[PDB]
Amino acid sequence: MAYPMQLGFQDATSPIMEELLHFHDHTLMIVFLISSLVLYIISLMLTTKLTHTSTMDAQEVETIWTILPAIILILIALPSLRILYMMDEINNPSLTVKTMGHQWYWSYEYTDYEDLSFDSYMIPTSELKPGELRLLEVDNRVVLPMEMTIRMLVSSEDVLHSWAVPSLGLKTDAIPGRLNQTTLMSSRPGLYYGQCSEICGSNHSFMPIVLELVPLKYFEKWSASML
Amino acid sequence: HETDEEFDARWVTYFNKPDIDAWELRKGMNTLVGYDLVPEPKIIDAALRACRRLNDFASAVRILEVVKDKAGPHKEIYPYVIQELRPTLNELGISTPEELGLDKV
Amino acid sequence: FENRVAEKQKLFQEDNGLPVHLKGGATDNILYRVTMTLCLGGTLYSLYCLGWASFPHK
Amino acid sequence: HQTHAYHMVNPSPWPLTGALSALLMTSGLTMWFHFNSMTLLMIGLTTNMLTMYQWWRDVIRESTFQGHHTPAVQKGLRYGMILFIISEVLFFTGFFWAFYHSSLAPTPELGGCWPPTGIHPLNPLEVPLLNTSVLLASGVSITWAHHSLMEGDRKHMLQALFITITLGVYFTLLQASEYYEAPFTISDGVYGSTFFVATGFHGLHVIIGSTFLIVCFFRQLKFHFTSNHHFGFEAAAWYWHFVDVVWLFLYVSIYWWGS
Amino acid sequence: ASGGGVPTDEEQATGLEREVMLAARKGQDPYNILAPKATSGTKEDPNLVPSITNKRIVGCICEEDNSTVIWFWLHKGEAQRCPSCGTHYKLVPHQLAH
Amino acid sequence: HYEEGPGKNIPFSVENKWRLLAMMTLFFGSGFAAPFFIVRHQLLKK
Amino acid sequence: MFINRWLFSTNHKDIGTLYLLFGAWAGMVGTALSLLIRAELGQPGTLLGDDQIYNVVVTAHAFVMIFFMVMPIMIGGFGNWLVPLMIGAPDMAFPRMNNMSFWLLPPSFLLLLASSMVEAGAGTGWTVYPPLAGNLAHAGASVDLTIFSLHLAGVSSILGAINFITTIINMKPPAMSQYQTPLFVWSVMITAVLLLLSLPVLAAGITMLLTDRNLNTTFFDPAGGGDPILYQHLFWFFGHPEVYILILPGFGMISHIVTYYSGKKEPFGYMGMVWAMMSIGFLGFIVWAHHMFTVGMDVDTRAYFTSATMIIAIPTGVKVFSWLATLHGGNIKWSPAMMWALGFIFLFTVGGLTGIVLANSSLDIVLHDTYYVVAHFHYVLSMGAVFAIMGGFVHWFPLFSGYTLNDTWAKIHFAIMFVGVNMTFFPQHFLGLSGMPRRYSDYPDAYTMWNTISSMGSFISLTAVMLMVFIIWEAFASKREVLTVDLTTTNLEWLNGCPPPYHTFEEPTYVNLK
Amino acid sequence: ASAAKGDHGGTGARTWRFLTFGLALPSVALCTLNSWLHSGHRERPAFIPYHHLRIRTKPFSWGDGNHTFFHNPRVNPLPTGYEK
Numbered sequence A: 001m002a003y004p005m006q007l008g009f010q011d012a013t014s015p016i017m018e019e020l021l022h023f024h025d026h027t028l029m030i031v032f033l034i035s036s037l038v039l040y041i042i043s044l045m046l047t048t049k050l051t052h053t054s055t056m057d058a059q060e061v062e063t064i065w066t067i068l069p070a071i072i073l074i075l076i077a078l079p080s081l082r083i084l085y086m087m088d089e090i091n092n093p094s095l096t097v098k099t100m101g102h103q104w105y106w107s108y109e110y111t112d113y114e115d116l117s118f119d120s121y122m123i124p125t126s127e128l129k130p131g132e133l134r135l136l137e138v139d140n141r142v143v144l145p146m147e148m149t150i151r152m153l154v155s156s157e158d159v160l161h162s163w164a165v166p167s168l169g170l171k172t173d174a175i176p177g178r179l180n181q182t183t184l185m186s187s188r189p190g191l192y193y194g195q196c197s198e199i200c201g202s203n204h205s206f207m208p209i210v211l212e213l214v215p216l217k218y219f220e221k222w223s224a225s226m227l
Numbered sequence B: 001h002e003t004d005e006e007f008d009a010r011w012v013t014y015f016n017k018p019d020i021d022a023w024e025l026r027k028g029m030n031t032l033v034g035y036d037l038v039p040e041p042k043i044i045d046a047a048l049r050a051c052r053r054l055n056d057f058a059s060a061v062r063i064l065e066v067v068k069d070k071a072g073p074h075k076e077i078y079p080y081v082i083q084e085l086r087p088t089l090n091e092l093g094i095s096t097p098e099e100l101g102l103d104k105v
Numbered sequence C: 001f002e003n004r005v006a007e008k009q010k011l012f013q014e015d016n017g018l019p020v021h022l023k024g025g026a027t028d029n030i031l032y033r034v035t036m037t038l039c040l041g042g043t044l045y046s047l048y049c050l051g052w053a054s055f056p057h058k
Numbered sequence D: 001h002q003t004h005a006y007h008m009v010n011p012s013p014w015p016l017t018g019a020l021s022a023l024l025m026t027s028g029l030t031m032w033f034h035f036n037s038m039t040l041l042m043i044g045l046t047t048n049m050l051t052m053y054q055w056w057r058d059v060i061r062e063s064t065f066q067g068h069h070t071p072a073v074q075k076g077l078r079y080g081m082i083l084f085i086i087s088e089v090l091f092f093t094g095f096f097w098a099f100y101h102s103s104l105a106p107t108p109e110l111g112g113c114w115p116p117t118g119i120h121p122l123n124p125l126e127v128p129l130l131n132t133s134v135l136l137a138s139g140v141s142i143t144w145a146h147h148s149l150m151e152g153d154r155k156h157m158l159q160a161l162f163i164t165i166t167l168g169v170y171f172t173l174l175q176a177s178e179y180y181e182a183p184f185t186i187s188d189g190v191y192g193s194t195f196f197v198a199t200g201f202h203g204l205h206v207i208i209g210s211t212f213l214i215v216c217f218f219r220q221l222k223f224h225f226t227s228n229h230h231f232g233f234e235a236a237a238w239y240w241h242f243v244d245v246v247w248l249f250l251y252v253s254i255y256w257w258g259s
Numbered sequence E: 001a002s003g004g005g006v007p008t009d010e011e012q013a014t015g016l017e018r019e020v021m022l023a024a025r026k027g028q029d030p031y032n033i034l035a036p037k038a039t040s041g042t043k044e045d046p047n048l049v050p051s052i053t054n055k056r057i058v059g060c061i062c063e064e065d066n067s068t069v070i071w072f073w074l075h076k077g078e079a080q081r082c083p084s085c086g087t088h089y090k091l092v093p094h095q096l097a098h
Numbered sequence F: 001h002y003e004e005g006p007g008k009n010i011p012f013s014v015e016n017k018w019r020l021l022a023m024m025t026l027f028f029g030s031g032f033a034a035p036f037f038i039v040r041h042q043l044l045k046k
Numbered sequence G: 001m002f003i004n005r006w007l008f009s010t011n012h013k014d015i016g017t018l019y020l021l022f023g024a025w026a027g028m029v030g031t032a033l034s035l036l037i038r039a040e041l042g043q044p045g046t047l048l049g050d051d052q053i054y055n056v057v058v059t060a061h062a063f064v065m066i067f068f069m070v071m072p073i074m075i076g077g078f079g080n081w082l083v084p085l086m087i088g089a090p091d092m093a094f095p096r097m098n099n100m101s102f103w104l105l106p107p108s109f110l111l112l113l114a115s116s117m118v119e120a121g122a123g124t125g126w127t128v129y130p131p132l133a134g135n136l137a138h139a140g141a142s143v144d145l146t147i148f149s150l151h152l153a154g155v156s157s158i159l160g161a162i163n164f165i166t167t168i169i170n171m172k173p174p175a176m177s178q179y180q181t182p183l184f185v186w187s188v189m190i191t192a193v194l195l196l197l198s199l200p201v202l203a204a205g206i207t208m209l210l211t212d213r214n215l216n217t218t219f220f221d222p223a224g225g226g227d228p229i230l231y232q233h234l235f236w237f238f239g240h241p242e243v244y245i246l247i248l249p250g251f252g253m254i255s256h257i258v259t260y261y262s263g264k265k266e267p268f269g270y271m272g273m274v275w276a277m278m279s280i281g282f283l284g285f286i287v288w289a290h291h292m293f294t295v296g297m298d299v300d301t302r303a304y305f306t307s308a309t310m311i312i313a314i315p316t317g318v319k320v321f322s323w324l325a326t327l328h329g330g331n332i333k334w335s336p337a338m339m340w341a342l343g344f345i346f347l348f349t350v351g352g353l354t355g356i357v358l359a360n361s362s363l364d365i366v367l368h369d370t371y372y373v374v375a376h377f378h379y380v381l382s383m384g385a386v387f388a389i390m391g392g393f394v395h396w397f398p399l400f401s402g403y404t405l406n407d408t409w410a411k412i413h414f415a416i417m418f419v420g421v422n423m424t425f426f427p428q429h430f431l432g433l434s435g436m437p438r439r440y441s442d443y444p445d446a447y448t449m450w451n452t453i454s455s456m457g458s459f460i461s462l463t464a465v466m467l468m469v470f471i472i473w474e475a476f477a478s479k480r481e482v483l484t485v486d487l488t489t490t491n492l493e494w495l496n497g498c499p500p501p502y503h504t505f506e507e508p509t510y511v512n513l514k
Numbered sequence H: 001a002s003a004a005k006g007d008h009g010g011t012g013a014r015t016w017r018f019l020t021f022g023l024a025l026p027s028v029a030l031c032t033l034n035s036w037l038h039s040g041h042r043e044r045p046a047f048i049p050y051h052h053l054r055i056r057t058k059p060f061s062w063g064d065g066n067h068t069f070f071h072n073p074r075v076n077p078l079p080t081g082y083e084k
């Protein structure tokens, strides 16, 4: 989850989110350098009494400021696309979970073997147990096995929603009539939080996602206790 | 393009035209100060002498000001120019902007 | 039919200071007043309807 | 007094009455869809027709009767009409896009096929083919009208333009009968939606185009056009060829490929 | 197999359209439809700028394909020079009628 | 013809600066106030 | 006379003034909406109501700022005032149709205000996506009034585009080629081509939404075989060109301002600036799906749109460096307009660069629908489009009015605004990176500090807006009448005095061909 | 290209009238004949209340709300089937 005064991404919980952090670091360095160079050159143009106001020839210098940005774009696009394609890589999941958005809560279906389903509602601030998080807790968490490749299928039963978990690098829109797929893999146990990410009406702000990542044996015990 | 020598000569020739008129004097100085250079003393010399043929003392003073101005922070250009122009300044009776106090606010 | 364009050219070039939309004569003023009356009255009416629709009506 | 060739237009009320007519038609549609009343909409339609009538009347006054359409002014109006037709092409492009989007990827609600289960399309070799011959034929007859006008031939210009209008009306009546006879409706899913909204906007443009040709016909009867100066006729022919080309794309896309 | 009955411009054009048509027939350009051809632009051979009044704006394109146009008011009387490149212009006032 | 020149090419008067201040205040203030009153209307409805 | 002049106008300057007044009033509306947004978010919890009333405010804020403030000011106001003057033309090609482009906008705005007064408003986002915007989740007239509002605004801009293209191509002096027209005129022509091609597609899309809501069509409704994602494609096919429409006239004014206050007769690299604007306009049509990287498109499609979006940085960077090269060697005049333009160059660059971060579909998974996007587009809009507008307004106000502003007050105004916008939007990068969604009326507690700072920044900008109104009052109150303006030899629009006569170029300029 | 014929010796009104009467209107006459033959009412198909057809998310703004604008009783069933 985010923490007070945070500046950057939530800590990466999946290998792909780590890839994105390293890619963002690379790209932000370029953003800082270019923005700073422009600021510097502005100050450089503005701080001399020397003048040159006759016609200036532009051809030579425009090679520089077309080829250099073209190279920089390629040095961004190359790692960007590599990550894009590694996200799409065939992975062979061991478990499929569906989630359906609604106004305003999520439901989950685990139907690989048993027909398990349930709803998942935000805890109202007035019902929070002490130390629990305002607008983020849910009554029924998405219990999931850690260190395993999971297929999440996302759809909606009414308007658009979007199913997001920032520390895993996940955001998949929830569109009625459409079954969108993404892959989920947590390197660690714990609780991982997200929020509905497509404006869906009155309580868009108040239909969060909470994953609960536990060892496989514990996941299996949980599934079995749902029978 | 033209060398420094060719550029200087064309400008000396321009200002030395005997019947240069007031419009041409101004067009020449105003064009010249658009380049990335402080004009050579031989160019200034010819322009000051054009001022004299045009009985225009004030523009002679102005030309000295714009030479100083074009040097920006390079403070030893103007004293060198004035050093090189000193005979002409004397011959023609041109007072410098400093000598006229026009360098003070 | 016969070609009466010259008569209309004379009519519409007459130096009477009228703007082109009134230069046809009195029928133009009529048609204009009808048009503008319906537009302004309809607009007022549309404002009244907004007023109506802006509140719950039992 | 000017020494350029351009047209300084008299101050005019019609921009304002046209803008207000748009307010009345849209608030009118709102009142019709949601508050069960046609009153505002009827007012807006009336003021729209009055606005268009008086505005284009004035353009006729300014040009045929007052001489303000110099070659420069006419060149501007040529550009303006072409640009206007371009914007209309892109409008139709949006409805073709919707048509191909739905028909190339038919969803499970349809039966996962196209046409959808339960949809029985018109035969494109029947009235839709006749319609195609009608509009292609009118493109031939309007071209005859255009050459007759340029050659100074009043009688044959009128005959050819009358034939063109008659074919446009025939298309419109054929399409009205096909609408009534169609066994599917605008509410029959995305098949009905794309079919009636795309051909319906096309039908409206046929009516607009025919109306424009009819204006030209009566202006021709009144000797407004010269053999060299007749931009209202040129613009209505370009618009008519646009309507004919949109039909051909509809026919191949929705009626033929889409059946 | 044909016929007539369509007015020509010569018969029916009116107003400014007709003025432009008639002037074009005489090879005159009172309504500034054409770009004038420049002279050498020297003081002896200045560009001659017609005007219905006593001053008119001139735009001077100093070298071919310059994208920058230099604009100035040209006044009646002694020829003036383009501020950028010095080419001379002289106003020739005249009524519109030729 | 119409009036020309500074203060004459505008649909509002600048003849009196205090009358002008009132006009500009009603003009810009009405635009700035409207959303506050619309929000009030919606909160008051139900 | 008053009605003839101001309701029946056929004059490009008077219609430009009407557009500037309209857009200034719309700017007040849109500022108020922005303050309500930031008041809701200024402390954790709920201030006004739930997300519905909140997102009616968000939705209205965006439509007012884009359709009633930026486009009427840039294209309707500066375009109509300046374009005919800059090419020596006596008016626009269609001076009467020009007046209907203006008069369609008060009805358009009226329809938008009606949508927010009836039922519970259109709390849809300015994107108006179904099914939330459809007749089950937004039953009643609000969304339909919003659609009609856009129809009228669209017709206004399509006809204005036809007018500008025709005027610019057809009404230059006969000797002037297109490569001798000023960059602002280029920027308006290219903007007009983008409007001409993009607005009809939006009109098609929102008409289909209208018929899905009222005529039982199912273009966007899976129950009939329709697809909510088709609406998104049609909307963004217009909506990405739309942001270049929002900035291109600003690029053109920046070019003129930077040239003028550098003391130069011409911008650096003129043909390069024309190339860059035409390239941006063209590329602006083939990138729209970077607004849809999380909807579930195929990976190859995401790869294409990533790559094509980033290409635009190259012509845009040419313009940035060419503005810098225009400053180079200048005798710089530190006027208030110059300050706005210099702030534009830097702040637009920052926003453009975070645009390039977002172009990466992989990283955009995490950044989409967060405040990182909000930060990107308010740097290019609140500190790019608006800064160009303010710089153009301060620079040309003496031409339009005949009166000078107080430069010291205008510099104060710039300084306040500069602090306010950066305090408002810079912390929104942190909020986005750390995961705060868009279109939220309240946020988990961790996000409090930056939302607090951002809301405080929005009040500083309000103080600048109030000050602007006072500054305009003071100029009309004091009536310092313009005498002389420098650089008229390369700024034709000034050469008929301030304000220019009602009719200008009755006798056209003389330009020969040689 | 692909057809035949073969004028283009000089385009004019006479040629376009020749095309109008000799090719275009005969085409229309032939297609009118063809259409006049394959007319005649087909048997209507059994009603099946498919959920992707006869959509009603809001009543139509005319009539009883449940009839399309050019409703044909013979061939357009209501959501509940053909009328009497």
Ligand SMILES: CCCCCCCCCCCCCCCCCC(=O)OCC(COC(=O)CCCCCCCCCCCCCCCCC)OC(=O)CCCCCCCCCCCCCCCCC
Residues within 6 Å of the ligand: A007, A008, A009, A028, A031, A032, A035, A036, A039, G350, G354, G422, G423, G426, G427, G429, G430, G433, G453
């Ligand atoms: C840029 C627009 C002008 C903005 C003006 C306001 C902002 C100041 C300029 C800002 C000073 C310039 C340097 C950026 C500072 C960002 C702080 C940071 O550590 O960034 C961290 C990252 C994420 O990084 C991490 O994973 C955290 C690891 C390190 C954390 C260490 C903890 C303590 C560090 C203390 C930093 C506190 C910062 C609080 C900052 C609170 C801000 C209100 O966040 C981000 O990406 C946010 C960036 C969004 C992309 C836009 C960059 C464009 C501006 C660059 C040119 C400025 C020129 C000077 C500026 C010239 C002005 C004329």
Ligand code: HEA
Residues within 6 Å of the ligand: A034, A038, A068, A069, A070, A072, A073, G127, G243, G244, G246, G247, G290, G291, G309, G310, G312, G313, G316, G317, G318, G320, G321, G348, G349, G350, G351, G352, G353, G354, G355, G356, G358, G359, G360, G364, G367, G368, G369, G373, G376, G377, G380, G381, G384, G385
């Ligand atoms: C003026 C308005 C404007 C402009 C000009 C732009 C310009 C750009 N925008 Fe953006 N954008 C918006 C307004 C604008 N945008 C709006 C309103 C939205 C949100 C819509 C909504 O959802 O409501 C949005 C959303 C948006 C998104 C979707 C993000 C998401 O929803 O998840 C993306 C993604 O690619 C994007 C990218 C860009 C890029 C790459 C540019 C480029 O054109 C920027 C190019 C400029 C530069 C790169 C800087 C100058 C260059 C140099 C100094 C050269 C050197 C640089 C390099 C080598 C990189 N924009």
Ligand code: HEA
Residues within 6 Å of the ligand: G020, G023, G024, G027, G028, G030, G031, G034, G035, G037, G038, G058, G059, G061, G062, G063, G065, G066, G069, G070, G073, G124, G125, G126, G127, G374, G378, G381, G382, G385, G386, G389, G390, G393, G421, G424, G437, G438, G439, G440, G441, G458, G461, G462, G465
């Ligand atoms: C041009 C466009 C524009 C501009 C200028 C602004 C200006 C501002 N916007 Fe805007 N905003 C949008 C376009 C714009 N915004 C869009 C498209 C959205 C997304 C909508 C959606 O999600 O659907 C958005 C969303 C948005 C949000 C996110 C809401 C959410 O996700 O819940 C926020 C939150 O802080 C915000 C705040 C502000 C603030 C504080 C300003 C302030 O900086 C404003 C301060 C004042 C001014 C900049 C001056 C106003 C101008 C004038 C007075 C003109 C004067 C006239 C003359 C000189 C002639 N905006």
Ligand SMILES: CCCCC/C=C\C/C=C\C/C=C\C/C=C\CCCC(=O)O[C@H](COC(=O)CCCCCCCCCCCCCCCCC)COP(=O)(O)OCCN
Residues within 6 Å of the ligand: D171, D172, D175, D176, D179, D180, D181, D182, D183, D184, D185, D186, D187, D196, D197, D199, D200, D201, D203, D204, G151, G154, G155, G200, G203, G207, G210, G211, G215, H068, H069, H070, H071, H072, H076
């Ligand atoms: C040649 C014959 C056809 C001629 C054209 C007929 C009318 C078309 C008019 C315009 C088309 C525009 C709106 C399209 C709406 C649908 C009309 C489609 C054409 C039509 O008429 O479709 C009919 C439905 O009409 C209906 O719903 C009701 C239609 C009446 C209400 C229309 C209200 C909507 C208006 C929206 C206008 C938006 C304009 C946007 C312009 C923006 C520009 C930038 C089909 O009849 P049916 O009974 O369902 O099936 C037949 C079964 N026997």
Ligand SMILES: CCCCC/C=C/C/C=C/CCCCCCCC(=O)O[C@H](COC(=O)CCCCCCCCCCCCCCC)COP(=O)(O)OCC[N+](C)(C)C
Residues within 6 Å of the ligand: A034, A041, A055, A056, A057, A058, A061, A064, A065, A068, A069, B002, B003, B004, B007, B008, B037, G321, G324, G325, G328
């Ligand atoms: C992410 C990407 C980042 C990219 C950053 C790129 C930075 C690029 C910077 C490099 C610029 C190098 C340009 C060099 C051109 C110099 C030509 C010249 O030097 O100027 C002259 C011609 O100028 C002329 O038309 C032209 C005169 C000089 C103007 C040349 C272009 C000016 C460029 C200004 C750039 C400002 C900053 C831009 C943004 C980085 C030739 O001068 P000479 O003394 O020989 O004779 C003249 C004097 N006599 C009289 C004594 C003969």
Ligand SMILES: CCCCCC/C=C/CCCCCCCCCC(=O)O[C@H](COC(=O)CCCCCCCCCCCCCCC)COP(=O)(O)OC[C@@H](O)CO
Residues within 6 Å of the ligand: D052, D056, D057, D059, D060, D063, D064, D069, D077, D081, D207, D208, D209, D211, D212, D215, D224, D225, D226, D229, D230, D231, D232, D233, D235, E012, E013
């Ligand atoms: C049952 C009935 C329903 C009717 C519904 C209403 C719809 C009908 C609108 C039909 C359009 C009629 C347009 C008539 C224009 C007449 C004015 C005209 O044609 O004006 C001509 C100029 O053209 C010009 O402005 C060119 C003007 C161009 C006009 C183009 C109009 C297209 C309008 C489409 C509008 C809706 C678009 C659809 C949106 C969904 C005048 O110049 P000339 O012809 O050279 O004459 C001069 C010579 O005489 C001199 O020798």
Ligand SMILES: CCCCCC/C=C/CCCCCCCCCC(=O)O[C@H](COC(=O)CCCCCCCCCCCCCCC)COP(=O)(O)OC[C@@H](O)CO
Residues within 6 Å of the ligand: H001, H002, H003
């Ligand atoms: C100017 C033109 C105006 C328009 C006139 C109408 C023209 C129509 C051309 C349509 C061609 C595409 C039709 C595709 C539809 C599928 C047909 C198909 O796929 O048919 C196959 C051959 O297709 C084929 O189109 C072969 C396709 C090529 C055939 C070309 C025939 C006409 C050629 C004219 C060329 C003129 C020159 C053009 C250049 C200017 C044959 O196999 P089936 O018939 O399946 O039989 C199997 C069953 O019996 C049992 O299971």
Ligand SMILES: CCCCCC/C=C\CCCCCCCCCC(=O)O[C@H](COC(=O)CCCCCCCCCCCCCCC)COP(=O)(O)OC[C@@H](O)CO
Residues within 6 Å of the ligand: D007, D009, D018, D019, D021, D022, D025, D026, D048, D051, D052, D055, D056, D058, D059, D062, D063, D068, D073, D077, D080, D081, D084, D087, D088, D091, G093, G094, G095, G096, G097, G098, G151, G152, G155, G158, G162, G200, G203
């Ligand atoms: C849901 C409903 C929403 C919309 C409601 C309707 C909104 C608008 C109400 C419109 C009423 C239109 C009234 C008639 C307008 C005639 C305009 C016209 O004809 O404009 C002409 C120029 O545009 C030209 O040619 C070429 C262009 C002609 C345009 C004709 C009008 C089209 C209006 C709608 C177009 C919509 C866009 C279509 C594509 C999506 C003439 O220009 P003027 O400046 O007048 O004169 C110049 C003089 O020299 C003439 O002698």
Ligand SMILES: CCCCCCCCCCO[C@@H]1O[C@H](CO)[C@@H](O[C@H]2O[C@H](CO)[C@@H](O)[C@H](O)[C@H]2O)[C@H](O)[C@H]1O
Residues within 6 Å of the ligand: C037, C038, C039, C040, C041, C042, C045, D036, D037, D038, D039, D040, D043
């Ligand atoms: C001068 C320029 C133009 C200005 C025109 C001003 C027009 C004012 C007419 C007012 O008449 C109203 O019409 C409503 C509709 O418009 C009626 O609602 C009625 O309309 C429906 C449809 O016919 C019925 O369903 C309802 O029973 C019924 O409330 C209502 O009774 C009546 O007060």
Ligand SMILES: CCCCCCCCCCO[C@@H]1O[C@H](CO)[C@@H](O[C@H]2O[C@H](CO)[C@@H](O)[C@H](O)[C@H]2O)[C@H](O)[C@H]1O
Residues within 6 Å of the ligand: F030, F033, F034, F035, F037, F038, F040, F041, F042, F044, F045
């Ligand atoms: C400023 C420019 C804005 C232009 C935008 C349009 C805004 C118009 C909003 C009007 O809002 C209404 O004001 C009434 C005020 O009279 C309120 O009535 C309320 O207040 C009344 C007066 O105190 C009571 O008598 C009523 O019972 C009570 O419902 C009503 O709820 C509210 O909808």
Ligand SMILES: C[C@H](CCC(=O)O)[C@H]1CC[C@H]2[C@@H]3[C@H](O)C[C@@H]4C[C@H](O)CC[C@]4(C)[C@H]3C[C@H](O)[C@]12C
Residues within 6 Å of the ligand: A059, A062, A063, A064, A066, G271, G272, G275, G318
């Ligand atoms: C050829 C054309 C116009 C030149 C003129 O007639 O003045 C010029 C103007 C801008 C130029 C382009 C821009 O300067 C941007 C690019 C610069 C690179 O150095 C070459 C390709 C590049 C894409 C240029 C190609 C070409 O020289 C362009 C397109």
Ligand SMILES: C[C@H](CCC(=O)O)[C@H]1CC[C@H]2[C@@H]3[C@H](O)C[C@@H]4C[C@H](O)CC[C@]4(C)[C@H]3C[C@H](O)[C@]12C
Residues within 6 Å of the ligand: C001, C002, D154, D155, D158, D159, D162, D163, E005
């Ligand atoms: C009246 C006019 C004669 C030319 C003239 O007025 O001098 C003639 C010439 C062409 C005639 C029209 C054309 O022949 C085309 C049409 C022929 C049909 O019989 C219907 C009337 C129709 C529309 C004719 C009406 C009328 O007899 C027209 C209009």
Ligand SMILES: C[C@H](CCC(=O)O)[C@H]1CC[C@H]2[C@@H]3[C@H](O)C[C@@H]4C[C@H](O)CC[C@]4(C)[C@H]3C[C@H](O)[C@]12C
Residues within 6 Å of the ligand: D101, G230, G233, G289, G300, G301, G304
């Ligand atoms: C997004 C749009 C389809 C919208 C639709 O669903 O309605 C589609 C239609 C054609 C597509 C393009 C064409 O298939 C050609 C290219 C194919 C590549 O694999 C991706 C890029 C590529 C350029 C495609 C991008 C995108 O998927 C496009 C542009």
Ligand code: CUA
Residues within 6 Å of the ligand: A101, A102, A103, A104, A160, A161, A162, A196, A197, A198, A199, A200, A201, A203, A204, A205, A207
């Ligand atoms: Cu569900 Cu937002």
Ligand SMILES: [Cu+2]
Residues within 6 Å of the ligand: G239, G240, G243, G287, G288, G290, G291
């Ligand atoms: Cu975009």
Ligand SMILES: [Mg+2]
Residues within 6 Å of the ligand: A162, A197, A198, G294, G368, G369
């Ligand atoms: Mg989204």
